[PDB]
Amino acid sequence: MEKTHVQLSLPVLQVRDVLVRGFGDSVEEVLSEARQHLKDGTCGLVEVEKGVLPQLEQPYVFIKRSDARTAPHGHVMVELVAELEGIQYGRSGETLGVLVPHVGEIPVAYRKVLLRK
């Protein structure tokens, strides 16, 4: 029943509000946990600016733009890419943000994406 892509609206969190600053301790774990939280509706997004990544925990999970032509509704097509110690696991387009668990923080916006699953 699982489609290749799912439309999600992700809460955009300010980095200083985030209570759980990463998904886990290895590349494989963070990707796994990020995908589960995305399915459960408990994933937030932090937009990357100077100073943001040092305030979060590695490995990082990024959502990156996967294509240039399809934004049905306002949902940019994205895929997950993890980073640890300067090495990325996946190759994709431009970063839309870094994913983190969402545990009830108040967002500043919602970001519509079409997530490749």
Ligand SMILES: OCCNCc1ccccc1
């Ligand atoms: O083992 C999967 C259970 N999820 C634990 C968790 C992680 C981050 C925020 C809230 C809860």
